[PDB]
mmCIF file of all heavy atoms in Angstrom:
data_model
loop_
_atom_site.group_PDB
_atom_site.id
_atom_site.type_symbol
_atom_site.label_atom_id
_atom_site.label_comp_id
_atom_site.label_asym_id
_atom_site.label_seq_id
_atom_site.Cartn_x
_atom_site.Cartn_y
_atom_site.Cartn_z
ATOM 1 N N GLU A 1 -5.334 -1.596 -17.483
ATOM 2 C CA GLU A 1 -4.365 -1.698 -18.559
ATOM 3 C C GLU A 1 -2.921 -1.552 -18.090
ATOM 4 O O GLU A 1 -2.031 -2.274 -18.535
ATOM 5 C CB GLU A 1 -4.634 -0.617 -19.597
ATOM 6 C CG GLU A 1 -5.506 -1.036 -20.735
ATOM 7 C CD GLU A 1 -5.334 -0.112 -21.903
ATOM 8 O OE1 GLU A 1 -5.593 1.102 -21.744
ATOM 9 O OE2 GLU A 1 -4.925 -0.602 -22.974
ATOM 10 N N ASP A 2 -2.704 -0.598 -17.195
ATOM 11 C CA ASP A 2 -1.380 -0.288 -16.677
ATOM 12 C C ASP A 2 -1.247 -0.693 -15.209
ATOM 13 O O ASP A 2 -1.767 -0.017 -14.326
ATOM 14 C CB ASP A 2 -1.141 1.218 -16.867
ATOM 15 C CG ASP A 2 0.214 1.675 -16.370
ATOM 16 O OD1 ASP A 2 1.167 0.863 -16.360
ATOM 17 O OD2 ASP A 2 0.328 2.866 -16.009
ATOM 18 N N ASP A 3 -0.543 -1.794 -14.949
ATOM 19 C CA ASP A 3 -0.370 -2.281 -13.582
ATOM 20 C C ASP A 3 0.599 -1.414 -12.785
ATOM 21 O O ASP A 3 0.881 -1.695 -11.624
ATOM 22 C CB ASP A 3 0.117 -3.727 -13.598
ATOM 23 C CG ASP A 3 1.584 -3.834 -13.922
ATOM 24 O OD1 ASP A 3 2.065 -3.070 -14.789
ATOM 25 O OD2 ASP A 3 2.260 -4.689 -13.315
ATOM 26 N N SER A 4 1.112 -0.361 -13.409
ATOM 27 C CA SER A 4 2.016 0.536 -12.716
ATOM 28 C C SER A 4 1.132 1.430 -11.868
ATOM 29 O O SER A 4 1.617 2.176 -11.026
ATOM 30 C CB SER A 4 2.766 1.414 -13.692
ATOM 31 O OG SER A 4 1.959 2.525 -14.008
ATOM 32 N N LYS A 5 -0.172 1.368 -12.123
ATOM 33 C CA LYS A 5 -1.148 2.166 -11.384
ATOM 34 C C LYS A 5 -1.600 1.423 -10.128
ATOM 35 O O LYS A 5 -2.541 1.845 -9.465
ATOM 36 C CB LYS A 5 -2.379 2.453 -12.243
ATOM 37 C CG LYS A 5 -2.100 3.106 -13.583
ATOM 38 C CD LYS A 5 -1.852 4.605 -13.472
ATOM 39 C CE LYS A 5 -1.765 5.264 -14.857
ATOM 40 N NZ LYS A 5 -1.747 6.759 -14.793
ATOM 41 N N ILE A 6 -0.951 0.306 -9.815
ATOM 42 C CA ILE A 6 -1.300 -0.467 -8.622
ATOM 43 C C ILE A 6 -0.098 -0.527 -7.693
ATOM 44 O O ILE A 6 1.001 -0.859 -8.127
ATOM 45 C CB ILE A 6 -1.721 -1.911 -8.980
ATOM 46 C CG1 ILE A 6 -3.013 -1.886 -9.811
ATOM 47 C CG2 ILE A 6 -1.889 -2.739 -7.697
ATOM 48 C CD1 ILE A 6 -3.524 -3.253 -10.218
ATOM 49 N N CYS A 7 -0.307 -0.210 -6.417
ATOM 50 C CA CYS A 7 0.782 -0.213 -5.443
ATOM 51 C C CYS A 7 0.824 -1.429 -4.530
ATOM 52 O O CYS A 7 -0.193 -1.857 -3.981
ATOM 53 C CB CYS A 7 0.733 1.052 -4.572
ATOM 54 S SG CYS A 7 1.109 2.609 -5.417
ATOM 55 N N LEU A 8 2.020 -1.993 -4.402
ATOM 56 C CA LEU A 8 2.248 -3.115 -3.509
ATOM 57 C C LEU A 8 2.947 -2.440 -2.350
ATOM 58 O O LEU A 8 3.950 -1.757 -2.535
ATOM 59 C CB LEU A 8 3.186 -4.155 -4.107
ATOM 60 C CG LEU A 8 3.674 -5.110 -3.012
ATOM 61 C CD1 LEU A 8 2.502 -5.842 -2.381
ATOM 62 C CD2 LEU A 8 4.644 -6.097 -3.605
ATOM 63 N N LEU A 9 2.420 -2.623 -1.155
ATOM 64 C CA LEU A 9 3.017 -1.964 -0.018
ATOM 65 C C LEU A 9 3.246 -2.880 1.153
ATOM 66 O O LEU A 9 2.541 -3.873 1.337
ATOM 67 C CB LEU A 9 2.115 -0.830 0.436
ATOM 68 C CG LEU A 9 1.670 0.133 -0.653
ATOM 69 C CD1 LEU A 9 0.624 1.056 -0.060
ATOM 70 C CD2 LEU A 9 2.870 0.912 -1.205
ATOM 71 N N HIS A 10 4.247 -2.535 1.948
ATOM 72 C CA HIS A 10 4.531 -3.290 3.148
ATOM 73 C C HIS A 10 4.181 -2.316 4.269
ATOM 74 O O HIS A 10 4.775 -1.232 4.385
ATOM 75 C CB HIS A 10 6.002 -3.704 3.209
ATOM 76 C CG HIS A 10 6.323 -4.606 4.361
ATOM 77 N ND1 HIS A 10 5.534 -5.685 4.704
ATOM 78 C CD2 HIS A 10 7.343 -4.590 5.251
ATOM 79 C CE1 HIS A 10 6.053 -6.293 5.755
ATOM 80 N NE2 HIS A 10 7.151 -5.649 6.108
ATOM 81 N N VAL A 11 3.184 -2.697 5.064
ATOM 82 C CA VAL A 11 2.717 -1.870 6.162
ATOM 83 C C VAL A 11 3.395 -2.246 7.474
ATOM 84 O O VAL A 11 3.135 -3.304 8.069
ATOM 85 C CB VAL A 11 1.182 -1.965 6.298
ATOM 86 C CG1 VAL A 11 0.701 -1.141 7.472
ATOM 87 C CG2 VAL A 11 0.527 -1.459 5.022
ATOM 88 N N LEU A 12 4.288 -1.357 7.899
ATOM 89 C CA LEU A 12 5.042 -1.531 9.124
ATOM 90 C C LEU A 12 4.621 -0.506 10.133
ATOM 91 O O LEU A 12 4.543 0.690 9.828
ATOM 92 C CB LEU A 12 6.536 -1.375 8.865
ATOM 93 C CG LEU A 12 7.127 -2.547 8.090
ATOM 94 C CD1 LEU A 12 8.555 -2.221 7.726
ATOM 95 C CD2 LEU A 12 7.021 -3.830 8.922
ATOM 96 N N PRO A 13 4.343 -0.961 11.358
ATOM 97 C CA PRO A 13 3.930 -0.047 12.418
ATOM 98 C C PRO A 13 4.850 1.160 12.392
ATOM 99 O O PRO A 13 5.857 1.189 11.674
ATOM 100 C CB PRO A 13 4.111 -0.884 13.678
ATOM 101 C CG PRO A 13 3.793 -2.275 13.200
ATOM 102 C CD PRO A 13 4.504 -2.336 11.868
ATOM 103 N N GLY A 14 4.513 2.160 13.181
ATOM 104 C CA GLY A 14 5.352 3.330 13.203
ATOM 105 C C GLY A 14 4.750 4.336 12.271
ATOM 106 O O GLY A 14 3.535 4.364 12.084
ATOM 107 N N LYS A 15 5.601 5.153 11.668
ATOM 108 C CA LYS A 15 5.131 6.194 10.773
ATOM 109 C C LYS A 15 5.579 5.936 9.344
ATOM 110 O O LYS A 15 5.362 6.760 8.449
ATOM 111 C CB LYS A 15 5.656 7.547 11.261
ATOM 112 C CG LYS A 15 5.218 7.890 12.689
ATOM 113 C CD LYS A 15 6.054 9.012 13.292
ATOM 114 C CE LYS A 15 6.017 10.268 12.422
ATOM 115 N NZ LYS A 15 6.902 11.347 12.963
ATOM 116 N N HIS A 16 6.188 4.776 9.121
ATOM 117 C CA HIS A 16 6.665 4.469 7.791
ATOM 118 C C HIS A 16 6.167 3.188 7.170
ATOM 119 O O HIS A 16 5.958 2.164 7.836
ATOM 120 C CB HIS A 16 8.191 4.502 7.774
ATOM 121 C CG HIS A 16 8.752 5.871 7.996
ATOM 122 N ND1 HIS A 16 8.505 6.922 7.137
ATOM 123 C CD2 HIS A 16 9.511 6.374 8.998
ATOM 124 C CE1 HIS A 16 9.088 8.014 7.600
ATOM 125 N NE2 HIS A 16 9.705 7.710 8.729
ATOM 126 N N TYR A 17 5.958 3.293 5.865
ATOM 127 C CA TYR A 17 5.510 2.189 5.041
ATOM 128 C C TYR A 17 6.396 2.295 3.815
ATOM 129 O O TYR A 17 6.837 3.398 3.458
ATOM 130 C CB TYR A 17 4.040 2.359 4.654
ATOM 131 C CG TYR A 17 3.772 3.410 3.594
ATOM 132 C CD1 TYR A 17 3.896 3.109 2.232
ATOM 133 C CD2 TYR A 17 3.341 4.689 3.948
ATOM 134 C CE1 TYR A 17 3.586 4.051 1.248
ATOM 135 C CE2 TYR A 17 3.026 5.640 2.971
ATOM 136 C CZ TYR A 17 3.148 5.314 1.623
ATOM 137 O OH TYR A 17 2.805 6.245 0.662
ATOM 138 N N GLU A 18 6.659 1.164 3.174
ATOM 139 C CA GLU A 18 7.517 1.161 1.998
ATOM 140 C C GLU A 18 6.819 0.687 0.719
ATOM 141 O O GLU A 18 5.948 -0.182 0.756
ATOM 142 C CB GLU A 18 8.759 0.314 2.293
ATOM 143 C CG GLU A 18 8.455 -1.006 3.007
ATOM 144 C CD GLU A 18 9.711 -1.720 3.513
ATOM 145 O OE1 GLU A 18 10.792 -1.080 3.544
ATOM 146 O OE2 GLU A 18 9.613 -2.917 3.885
ATOM 147 N N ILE A 19 7.202 1.283 -0.405
ATOM 148 C CA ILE A 19 6.623 0.933 -1.687
ATOM 149 C C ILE A 19 7.480 -0.076 -2.439
ATOM 150 O O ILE A 19 8.641 0.191 -2.747
ATOM 151 C CB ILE A 19 6.464 2.166 -2.561
ATOM 152 C CG1 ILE A 19 5.504 3.141 -1.884
ATOM 153 C CG2 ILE A 19 5.978 1.760 -3.941
ATOM 154 C CD1 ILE A 19 5.316 4.452 -2.642
ATOM 155 N N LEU A 20 6.893 -1.236 -2.727
ATOM 156 C CA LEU A 20 7.563 -2.314 -3.463
ATOM 157 C C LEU A 20 7.271 -2.169 -4.959
ATOM 158 O O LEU A 20 8.182 -2.256 -5.788
ATOM 159 C CB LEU A 20 7.075 -3.686 -2.977
ATOM 160 C CG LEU A 20 7.692 -4.306 -1.714
ATOM 161 C CD1 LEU A 20 7.591 -3.341 -0.543
ATOM 162 C CD2 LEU A 20 6.986 -5.624 -1.393
ATOM 163 N N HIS A 21 5.997 -1.966 -5.296
ATOM 164 C CA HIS A 21 5.583 -1.764 -6.684
ATOM 165 C C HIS A 21 4.710 -0.505 -6.769
ATOM 166 O O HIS A 21 4.049 -0.125 -5.792
ATOM 167 C CB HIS A 21 4.826 -2.993 -7.225
ATOM 168 C CG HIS A 21 4.403 -2.863 -8.666
ATOM 169 N ND1 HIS A 21 5.141 -2.166 -9.605
ATOM 170 C CD2 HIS A 21 3.324 -3.349 -9.329
ATOM 171 C CE1 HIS A 21 4.534 -2.225 -10.778
ATOM 172 N NE2 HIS A 21 3.429 -2.938 -10.638
ATOM 173 N N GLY A 22 4.738 0.147 -7.931
ATOM 174 C CA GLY A 22 3.951 1.349 -8.134
ATOM 175 C C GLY A 22 4.762 2.481 -8.727
ATOM 176 O O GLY A 22 5.986 2.424 -8.755
ATOM 177 N N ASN A 23 4.082 3.514 -9.208
ATOM 178 C CA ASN A 23 4.761 4.658 -9.791
ATOM 179 C C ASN A 23 4.529 5.912 -8.976
ATOM 180 O O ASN A 23 5.262 6.891 -9.110
ATOM 181 C CB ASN A 23 4.292 4.868 -11.224
ATOM 182 C CG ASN A 23 5.172 4.156 -12.219
ATOM 183 O OD1 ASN A 23 5.748 3.112 -11.917
ATOM 184 N ND2 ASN A 23 5.275 4.713 -13.418
ATOM 185 N N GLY A 24 3.511 5.879 -8.125
ATOM 186 C CA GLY A 24 3.214 7.025 -7.283
ATOM 187 C C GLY A 24 2.896 6.596 -5.863
ATOM 188 O O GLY A 24 3.241 5.491 -5.447
ATOM 189 N N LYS A 25 2.257 7.476 -5.106
ATOM 190 C CA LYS A 25 1.878 7.143 -3.744
ATOM 191 C C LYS A 25 0.496 6.536 -3.853
ATOM 192 O O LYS A 25 -0.227 6.807 -4.808
ATOM 193 C CB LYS A 25 1.822 8.399 -2.879
ATOM 194 C CG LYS A 25 3.174 9.023 -2.660
ATOM 195 C CD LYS A 25 3.065 10.340 -1.930
ATOM 196 C CE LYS A 25 4.432 10.814 -1.453
ATOM 197 N NZ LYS A 25 5.033 9.873 -0.455
ATOM 198 N N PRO A 26 0.104 5.702 -2.885
ATOM 199 C CA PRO A 26 -1.232 5.118 -2.991
ATOM 200 C C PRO A 26 -2.299 6.216 -3.055
ATOM 201 O O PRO A 26 -1.999 7.418 -3.047
ATOM 202 C CB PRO A 26 -1.352 4.280 -1.717
ATOM 203 C CG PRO A 26 0.061 3.959 -1.376
ATOM 204 C CD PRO A 26 0.786 5.240 -1.665
ATOM 205 N N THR A 27 -3.551 5.784 -3.122
ATOM 206 C CA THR A 27 -4.674 6.700 -3.176
ATOM 207 C C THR A 27 -4.803 7.486 -1.880
ATOM 208 O O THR A 27 -4.375 7.040 -0.821
ATOM 209 C CB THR A 27 -5.985 5.936 -3.404
ATOM 210 O OG1 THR A 27 -7.085 6.764 -3.014
ATOM 211 C CG2 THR A 27 -6.008 4.660 -2.587
ATOM 212 N N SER A 28 -5.408 8.658 -1.974
ATOM 213 C CA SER A 28 -5.624 9.492 -0.808
ATOM 214 C C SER A 28 -6.364 8.707 0.286
ATOM 215 O O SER A 28 -6.079 8.879 1.471
ATOM 216 C CB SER A 28 -6.460 10.721 -1.188
ATOM 217 O OG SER A 28 -5.951 11.372 -2.340
ATOM 218 N N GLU A 29 -7.310 7.851 -0.099
ATOM 219 C CA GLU A 29 -8.071 7.096 0.899
ATOM 220 C C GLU A 29 -7.358 5.865 1.436
ATOM 221 O O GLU A 29 -7.955 4.994 2.075
ATOM 222 C CB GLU A 29 -9.463 6.723 0.363
ATOM 223 C CG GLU A 29 -9.501 5.945 -0.930
ATOM 224 C CD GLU A 29 -10.921 5.782 -1.440
ATOM 225 O OE1 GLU A 29 -11.616 6.809 -1.584
ATOM 226 O OE2 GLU A 29 -11.344 4.638 -1.698
ATOM 227 N N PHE A 30 -6.061 5.817 1.173
ATOM 228 C CA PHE A 30 -5.207 4.736 1.633
ATOM 229 C C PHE A 30 -5.385 4.540 3.145
ATOM 230 O O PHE A 30 -5.615 3.422 3.616
ATOM 231 C CB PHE A 30 -3.758 5.085 1.246
ATOM 232 C CG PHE A 30 -2.707 4.537 2.166
ATOM 233 C CD1 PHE A 30 -2.776 3.228 2.655
ATOM 234 C CD2 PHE A 30 -1.623 5.335 2.535
ATOM 235 C CE1 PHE A 30 -1.775 2.721 3.510
ATOM 236 C CE2 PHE A 30 -0.619 4.845 3.383
ATOM 237 C CZ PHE A 30 -0.696 3.535 3.873
ATOM 238 N N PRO A 31 -5.303 5.633 3.919
ATOM 239 C CA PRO A 31 -5.454 5.591 5.375
ATOM 240 C C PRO A 31 -6.718 4.856 5.788
ATOM 241 O O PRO A 31 -6.699 4.001 6.685
ATOM 242 C CB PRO A 31 -5.517 7.059 5.746
ATOM 243 C CG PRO A 31 -4.631 7.690 4.723
ATOM 244 C CD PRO A 31 -5.066 7.013 3.464
ATOM 245 N N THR A 32 -7.821 5.202 5.128
ATOM 246 C CA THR A 32 -9.105 4.586 5.418
ATOM 247 C C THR A 32 -9.018 3.078 5.239
ATOM 248 O O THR A 32 -9.336 2.321 6.148
ATOM 249 C CB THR A 32 -10.188 5.130 4.502
ATOM 250 O OG1 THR A 32 -10.230 6.557 4.604
ATOM 251 C CG2 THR A 32 -11.523 4.565 4.903
ATOM 252 N N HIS A 33 -8.574 2.651 4.062
ATOM 253 C CA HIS A 33 -8.413 1.230 3.748
ATOM 254 C C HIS A 33 -7.561 0.579 4.815
ATOM 255 O O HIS A 33 -7.819 -0.548 5.256
ATOM 256 C CB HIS A 33 -7.705 1.061 2.399
ATOM 257 C CG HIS A 33 -8.572 1.358 1.216
ATOM 258 N ND1 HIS A 33 -9.017 0.378 0.356
ATOM 259 C CD2 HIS A 33 -9.096 2.521 0.763
ATOM 260 C CE1 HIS A 33 -9.778 0.923 -0.575
ATOM 261 N NE2 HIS A 33 -9.843 2.223 -0.350
ATOM 262 N N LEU A 34 -6.523 1.306 5.211
ATOM 263 C CA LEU A 34 -5.607 0.825 6.217
ATOM 264 C C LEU A 34 -6.384 0.310 7.395
ATOM 265 O O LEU A 34 -6.250 -0.851 7.783
ATOM 266 C CB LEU A 34 -4.690 1.943 6.683
ATOM 267 C CG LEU A 34 -3.210 1.605 6.558
ATOM 268 C CD1 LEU A 34 -2.413 2.592 7.388
ATOM 269 C CD2 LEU A 34 -2.958 0.173 7.025
#
């Protein structure tokens, strides 16, 4: 229902990633998916 619950991310090597869309941080299992 709420697409604000979905994060669009740009995965850049290093220790940083940036959030394009979303209201919070991705899911805890983000690393795994990564």
Side-chain angles (χ1 to χ4, degrees):
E1 267 200 300
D2 180 28
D3 77 321
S4 84
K5 305 281 188 171
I6 295 180
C7 292
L8 165 61
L9 309 172
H10 186 45
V11 178
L12 288 173
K15 301 164 56 183
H16 293 298
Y17 74 84
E18 44 190 14
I19 298 177
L20 278 54
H21 182 33
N23 268 31
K25 293 174 168 297
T27 161
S28 311
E29 56 187 54
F30 150 43
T32 305
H33 285 250
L34 235 196

